[PDB]
Every structure is written in C-alpha cells, then in structure tokens.
Specification:
Order of helices and strands of chain A: EE
Number of strands of chain A: 2
Glycosylation sites (chain A): 35
Oligomer: part of a larger assembly
Largest sheet of chain A: 2 strands, antiparallel
Radius of gyration of chain A: 13 Å
Distance between the termini of chain A: 8 Å
Protein name (chain A): Spike protein S1
Chain lengths: 36, 48
C-alpha cells in the first residue's frame, strides 16, 4: 500500500543561516506528492 | 613498478602526499594557529 507523502522531507540544505530570503538549491530530496 | 634501487632517474618512487582542502557548511575543524585576540565592538576593524 502507498500513502501520499504530500510535502514532507524538506531539510536545511546547509549549515548556513539565511533570513527572509528565497534561496534555491539542489540536493537529494523527496519529490512532492510521491508515493511512499 | 619495481623501482630498481640505484637506477631510476624517473624510476624512483616519489612519495607523493596530496592535501585536499574542503570547506563546507560546517565550522572549520582544522584552522591556523595562535592569535585569538580580544574582540572589539562598534569600531571599524579588519576581522578574520
């Protein structure tokens, strides 16, 4: 059986602190709305 | 290789150590030596 992992699986890409900014990065993440 | 003991001009073992430097998100583990100075605030200063 599979369930919808809607949004989850996001984590801080790096140690660096950032605030009030939209930053784009590329890492290994769980694609949204993927079956688990 | 073999490296004939006396013979190699090119033939001798060159022990090569390579240092690879990596900086990451994280705090530096290996850093240069001595100089932790008194931090001064509210003043234009050069900082490291």
């Amino acid at each position: 059986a599979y369930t919808n992992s809607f949004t989850r699986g996001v984590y801080y890409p790096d140690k660096v602190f950032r605030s009030s900014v939209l930053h784009s990065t590329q890492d290994l993440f769980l694609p949204f709305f993927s079956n688990v | 290789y073999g490296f004939q003991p006396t013979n190699g001009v090119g033939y001798q073992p060159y022990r090569v150590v390579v240092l690879s430097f990596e900086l990451l998100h994280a705090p530096a583990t290996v850093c240069g030596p001595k100089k932790s100075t008194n931090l001064v605030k509210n003043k234009c200063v050069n900082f490291n």
